Design brief:
- The structure is a homodimer.
- By secondary structure, chain A is α/β, with parallel strands linked by helices.
- Chain A folds into two domains: 200 residues, 3-Layer(aba) Sandwich (Rossmann fold); 266 residues, no CATH class.
- In chain A, 52% of the residues lie in helices and 10% in strands.
- In chain A, the strands form two sheets. In chain A, strands 6-7-8-3-9-10 form a six-stranded mixed beta sheet, with helices on both faces. In chain A, strands 2-1-4-5 form a four-stranded antiparallel beta sheet, sandwiched between helices.
- In chain A, helix 19 runs antiparallel to helix 21 and helix 21 packs antiparallel against helix 23.
- Chains A and B meet through helix 6, helix 9, helix 13 and helix 14 of A and helix 9, helix 13 and helix 14 of B.
- The complex binds 1,2-dioleoyl-sn-glycero-3-phosphoethanolamine (PEE) (5 copies), the ligand CC(C)C[C@H]1c2[nH]c3cc(OC4CCCC4)ccc3c2C[C@H]2C(=O)N[C@@H](CCC(=O)OC(C)(C)C)C(=O)N21 (2 copies) and cholesterol (10 copies).
- One 1,2-dioleoyl-sn-glycero-3-phosphoethanolamine binds next to helix 23 of chain B.
- Chains A, B: Pfam families: ABC2_membrane, ABC2_membrane_7, ABC_tran.
- Chains A, B: It comes from Homo sapiens.
- Chains A, B: It is a multi-pass membrane protein.
- Chains A, B: Its EC number is 7.6.2.2.
């Protein structure tokens, strides 16, 4: 098996206040089962992220060396890593998660039969054969238990057959017998020859008896490294008395807590386990798949997540149908009189600002899947471009095509707008473009963040500053010229100007007029063009289509900013 | 000290699926330190809530009896209870929390000097004298450490000098040496003669050596009850071998988990610790303060929380000032021409719907303080009426008076609305009433819930169905008569109709007119009354003030519904 042998690791970060969180750590990890103990604030998870190259090579100041050689560039694609909180797809089943991982991690050369036999072998080794085709589980659907979610998360990284297998906290978040079952599974894996390296948090003695090698850390300094049975005898030789009926790992943490660390670290420097470790270390020292493949599998997984999550996808269509029926019931039969201007401008304003505010629920998209994106980009399933295009083609495109089609098909014929063939399609296309553009601004603000609330609030602030300049509330010509340049930034202004220019052309709003008051008395606003001029809207068809080209360019700019915020994200 | 002696407790709930979660449990708890162990799903916290009467007496089916007598009605006011997650005020300091608890729990007869000496004694017994006047801590301000927060939460219930002191999970959420310090404090309390009863979760042996009496529970059934030293010897006599270097409490849970419960519960029925317990049990068996006082202290605490939380109180005033300056900059100098109708109706619509949507941030009020309300109502600090009126007089009144005054004083004179003395005050009063009414609907929907998101979303749905019927988007006379009755439910319609009737009276919107087109040609909308009629608004002053009486009655109805949702809440 592999022998991961790290020597003289110094590590430091910038919080810019610079601080070392690993001081001087060396150790050898045999084929077998290697554990890392310590407090939360100690460097246990930091050292585990360092050995799997999950932290940036800028701060790392020592050689990490496997089997006699430094770590190659293919190492992250070769050595699996298992996150603390599970990143499995809750809506997909256990076989389809392994199908996804086998499709992206393994080569394109292999047969589907070979990958299916590999998945069957991996799901046989885990004991997930009873639940091989049930859903993993979310809030709305009941699913598989937490220990079998953790076995699924291990099995996703077992597909590529890793030589070294890392594990961040496989015990925590679980109950006791569940944790013992997971660790007995890990021991059965480690007897094969696979080198398991894991960090944990306050284990039991039934856990602690299983360990092959131990590494204790505290406040960034190495406290012990040797075989795990030898550790209690070493701390008896250090002078700390162990009491009867006490867990030795709890005794190890009780040494750290003080019933000092610079006093206790130097005691390990004067050990027999330290000179032997240096005597071993100085002996040793002195993409895969194409683009369309990644886009197809990412888009397939995200669409299957969209079907398997029924509530936030179906409920938007239900609210769209109900609100379309309500707007068809209130504005029913738009007349051509003095109320016709107010009703038509009001319903077009409601439809565009409804599209804008209903596109706030796409903040959720790149924020819920953030840790899964980081883990799967470092582990090397896909590029950022294929993730981005797959998750646009999957979750953004149909869930913004369908509500705008439903709004136009419902509120068009109940209201009785301009009864032409193409005006219907221009209205449908304008609502679809304002939906895409508002949702693309949502993705531009929301991508690469961890919380939903600040991005949602910022979207709503931007929209209430756009709807002032939309043109119903203020007249755009009466804004001062040092402030009227902000009207180009606003998406409802383009959607609403396009809909007003679509609908107000052939209409007359003075019944029985036939020039009674001599082109009626200069204050009438009778024909639709006379309204549409004094709003500041052009009458030529470029006055229609410049709104759509402005929306298309805002889609392109906002999706490019969203892509650059995903691409320049701190992945480590 | 007190001897809490419970006998033959059977307990069951309705989830309506009916299920027993405590089967047949009896035990005696001496003066000293009593622990309750078990799994999470076991009845440890349920039995601890039963003994302190924190669960309803409907499901309870056995006598709980202290010191030879059943529990009186004053018992919750006499025996302290300490919640798992701390309910201390994060913004108040450690001395002012104890000042609050001493003001509400103790009598009105006692001197302020006596209560201050009591608080000094309690804060001396805890070891909080170094941090006696520092803030407890929230997100924005750094504060006291978690163990000293837990000592503060114990000290809040130590004020009334309880005979019996309950504690739900005093170890969890903490680190190891912190937990040992808290439990050594508890042992120092229990040596005085105070009967401490607590539930915990997987303790250490340094914890477990301190116990005076033990009660193990599993799946609703009693597993052991006796002295805590005797428990391991009893389970050796049961036939379960304990291994060396193993925590006995972890061994107790490992017996439960199965390395059955109906097999293992009957073994305790055949004990020597069970017949002795029945031999002891059958021997034994066979507001404070006025209303204005509670309102004063609750309102004082909530106002001090409003000052000590600077961000969500100051940031609303900053956003109000900035948005008032923006609306003063866009709509600057409202002219009297064909754009005058559109600009005035637009800015009045923006101001009212701004008041409505900015009153969504009062959903937070009764939802953040929900567990603190339940705990302090059961422990008996205040009635529901005094909590409700204090938290209206503290957080609702000034934070909705100040933004409306700021909006009116800024956007009034920059826009140049109707330059009178009383029109300014009618505008300020209408904005204040629409703020109160929207926020009162927020409190009516939001009170008595635990999550913020569903109530916030429901507020926003109600507001977008109110703003259609406000009167700018649709003309209210052109709505069909089977649907035009919904216009009375909507708060922006009353605020916006009152502002339009306030502002559109003395205005003329046709310059240089002097009857050129013979009362100009029937389609002009020149004078303000001709606009204000065709909207459906009365011209008499009752057409102004019926909006304010509708807003006042919606304030009264919504605050009454909020009060009834607090009063009829399931407190147990
Ligand atoms: C907003 C809502 C609408 C979203 C629209 C999303 C459009 C997705 C289009 C998917 C097209 C699938 C095929 C793409 C393709 O192969 O394009 C060729 C080309 C090859 O890519 P190289 O990445 O750099 O990598 C090596 C590949 N051997 O792809 C690209 O350049 C990116 C995709 C095409 C350009 C953009 C199309 C829009
Ligand atoms: C004249 C109209 C007056 C309207 C007055 C205001 C009414 C406001 C009602 C809003 C309710 C908001 C609920 C918030 C929590 C949402 C919970 C949820 O997910 O509900 C699900 C449920 C749909 O469940 P499905 O996903 O279809 O289940 C699968 C079945 N094949 O959601 C809904 O129906 C949406 C809420 C009610 C619809 C109408 C809402 C009003 C806006 C239009
Ligand atoms: C919406 C934004 C505005 C919120 C407005 C909040 C109004 C707060 C009113 C504060 C009133 C303070 C004075 C209350 C007072 O003195 O109450 C006396 C008295 C106390 O009654 P019981 O003591 O406990 O026993 C008395 C037996 N003889 O009566 C009441 O409390 C009645 C209710 C108070 C007034 C309600 C209307 C306001
Ligand atoms: C022409 C106008 C164009 C505007 C374009 C859109 C701009 C959008 C800006 C909104 C930012 C939203 C931030 C969301 C997170 C809020 C974080 C927060 O609490 O910020 C605090 C900070 C105030 O801190 P204090 O509480 O005063 O600290 C005490 C100092 N004595 O909050 C703010 O100022 C609000 C944020 C921006 C202010 C303007 C808001 C938008 C215009 C209205
Ligand atoms: C707060 C509680 C009071 C406000 C809510 C009620 C609304 C005010 C009263 C409305 C009313 O009827 O006013 C009477 C009368 C109008 O006559 P009407 O009969 O309604 O119509 C004329 C033809 N008959 O109003 C007036 O004379 C104007 C002055 C009195 C009413 C307005 C002032 C109310 C008192 C001030 C409250 C300030 C509260 C500030 C903190 C909140
Ligand atoms: C769809 C509608 C009922 C809610 C939608 C929405 N329209 C708005 C339109 C606005 O124009 C104003 C009308 C008069 C002048 C301007 C203003 C605000 C809004 C909002 C709020 C927004 C929201 O807060 N969230 C999303 C998704 C909510 C959702 O998913 O709801 C269910 C029940 C779970 C399905 C949304 O759709 N709205
Ligand atoms: C104050 C404003 C900038 C935000 C406010 C608000 N106005 C609205 C007005 C609306 O009318 C439409 C305007 C054209 C016709 C109808 C519609 C929606 C809104 C919203 C959103 C609402 C909200 O989402 N909640 C609080 C946020 C306060 C807050 O805590 O944010 C800071 C920055 C941290 C202080 C709010 O006040 N807004
Ligand atoms: C009438 C409206 C809603 C039509 C909108 C078009 C939608 C439904 C289309 C456009 C792009 C499509 C996706 C394109 C590519 C793939 C990859 C394939 O391996 C599974 C299907 C999947 C994920 C498609 C699902 C359906 C899809 C999202
Ligand atoms: C979004 C999806 C569902 C619909 C897309 C809208 C399409 C079909 C619409 C939007 C713009 C429309 C065009 C707008 C103007 C004209 C000029 C006139 O000679 C009628 C046909 C023609 C050329 C229309 C054809 C249909 C059209 C291209
Ligand atoms: C009429 C006006 C006020 C409407 C609002 C337009 C302006 C203010 C909006 C529209 C596009 C927005 C930007 C979109 C994308 C990003 C990238 C993100 O990493 C920070 C916020 C930032 C930089 C946004 C800031 C605000 C923004 C520039
Ligand atoms: C990151 C954010 C700020 C990017 C915003 C880009 C905006 C401001 C740009 C992108 C596309 C642009 C439009 C493209 C084309 C035209 C037609 C021209 O005859 C008038 C200007 C107008 C209507 C532009 C206005 C400004 C515009 C909408
Ligand atoms: C006119 C409107 C509807 C078109 C929609 C614009 C879409 C299709 C555009 C805008 C931003 C674009 C992305 C911008 C940057 C990159 C990085 C490049 O290495 C691969 C392509 C990729 C990922 C682009 C794919 C296509 C893209 C998503
Ligand atoms: C100009 C505007 C903002 C004025 C609004 C009035 C506000 C500031 C007033 C009205 C009611 C007042 C409260 C009434 C009673 C008490 C109890 C007292 O023991 C502490 C002050 C406290 C909590 C007051 C704080 C200030 C208060 C909230
Ligand atoms: C909320 C706070 C800050 C302001 C309260 C507004 C008060 C002061 C306003 C609102 C309604 C106003 C009244 C409305 C109508 C009239 C009739 C006329 O003869 C002028 C005075 C008088 C009688 C006003 C006096 C001031 C008044 C009572
Ligand atoms: C113009 C119309 C559509 C405006 C909307 C008004 C109606 C639908 C609103 C206003 C007041 C609201 C109620 C206020 C209080 C409560 C009590 C709460 O426990 C359940 C919701 C419930 C029962 C709300 C339901 C919706 C409600 C009745
Ligand atoms: C729980 C919710 C639904 C309660 C809502 C109560 C609403 C519908 C009630 C309470 C007060 C009422 C108003 C009280 C007084 C008047 C004056 C009268 O000349 C016309 C009706 C009008 C304007 C009422 C309309 C309906 C009204 C606003
Ligand atoms: C016209 C507007 C501004 C007045 C505001 C209405 C306020 C003051 C009213 C409306 C609802 C009322 C509450 C309704 C019910 C009760 C329960 C009772 O046992 C004590 C009083 C108490 C708690 C009331 C106090 C006063 C109250 C909060």
């Amino acid at each position: 098996g592999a022998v991961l042998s790290f020597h003289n690791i110094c590590y430091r970060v910038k919080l810019p206040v610079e601080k070392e969180i690993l001081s001087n750590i060396n150790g050898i990890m045999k084929p077998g089962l290697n554990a890392i103990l310590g407090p939360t604030g100690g460097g246990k998870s930091s050292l585990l992220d360092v050995l799997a190259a999950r932290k940036d090579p800028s701060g790392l100041s020592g050689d990490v060396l496997i089997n006699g050689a430094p770590r190659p560039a293919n190492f992250k694609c070769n050595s699996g890593y298992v996150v603390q909180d599970d990143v499995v797809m809750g809506t997909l089943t256990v076989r389809e998660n392994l199908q996804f991982s086998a499709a992206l991690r393994l080569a394109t050369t292999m047969t589907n039969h070979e990958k299916n036999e590999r998945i069957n072998r991996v799901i046989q080794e885990l004991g997930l054969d009873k639940v091989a085709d049930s859903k993993v589980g979310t809030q709305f659907i009941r699913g598989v238990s937490g220990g079998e979610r953790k076995r699924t998360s291990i099995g996703m990284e077992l597909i590529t057959d890793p030589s070294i297998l890392f594990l961040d906290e496989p015990t925590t978040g679980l109950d006791s017998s569940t944790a013992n079952a997971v660790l007995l599974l890990l021991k059965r894996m480690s007897k094969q020859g696979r080198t398991i390296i894991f960090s944990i948090h306050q284990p039991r003695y039934s856990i602690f008896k299983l360990f092959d090698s131990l590494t204790l850390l505290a406040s960034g300094r190495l406290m012990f490294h040797g075989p795990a049975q030898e550790a209690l005898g070493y701390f008896e030789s250090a002078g700390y008395h162990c009491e009867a009926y006490n867990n030795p790992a709890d005794f190890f943490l009780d040494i750290i807590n003080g019933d000092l660390i610079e006093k206790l670290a130097e005691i390990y420097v004067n050990s027999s386990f330290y000179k032997e470790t240096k005597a071993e270390l100085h002996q040793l020292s002195g993409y895969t798949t194409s683009f369309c493949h990644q886009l197809r599998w990412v888009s397939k997984r995200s669409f299957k997540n969209l079907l398997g999550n029924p509530q936030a996808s179906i409920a938007q269509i239900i609210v769209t149908v109900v609100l379309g029926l309500v707007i068809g019931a209130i504005y029913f039969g738009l007349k051509n009189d003095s109320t016709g201007i107010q009703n038509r401008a009001g319903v077009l304003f409601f439809l565009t600002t409804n599209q804008c505010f209903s596109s706030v629920s796409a903040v959720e998209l790149f924020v819920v899947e953030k840790k899964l994106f980081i883990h799967e980009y470092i582990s090397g399933y896909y590029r950022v471009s294929s993730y981005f295009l797959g998750k646009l083609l999957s979750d953004l495109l149909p869930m913004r095509m369908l509500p705008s089609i439903i709004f136009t098909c419902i509120v068009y014929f109940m209201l009785g707008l301009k009864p032409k063939a193409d005006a219907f399609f221009v209205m449908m296309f304008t609502l679809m473009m304002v939906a895409y553009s508002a949702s693309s601004m949502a993705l531009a603000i929301a991508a690469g963040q961890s919380v939903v609330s600040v991005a949602t609030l910022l979207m709503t602030i931007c929209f209430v500053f756009m709807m002032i300049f939309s043109g119903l509330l203020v007249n755009l010509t009466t804004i001062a010229s040092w402030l009227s340049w902000l009207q180009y930034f606003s998406i409802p202004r383009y959607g609403f100007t396009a809909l007003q220019h679509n609908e107000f052309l052939g209409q007359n709003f003075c019944p029985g007029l036939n020039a009674t008051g001599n082109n009626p008395c200069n204050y009438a606003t009778c024909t639709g063009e006379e309204y549409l001029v004094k709003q500041g809207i052009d009458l030529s068809p470029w006055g229609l289509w410049k709104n759509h080209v402005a929306l298309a360019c805002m889609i392109v700019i906002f999706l490019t900013i969203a892509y650059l915020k995903l691409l320049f994200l701190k992945k480590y």
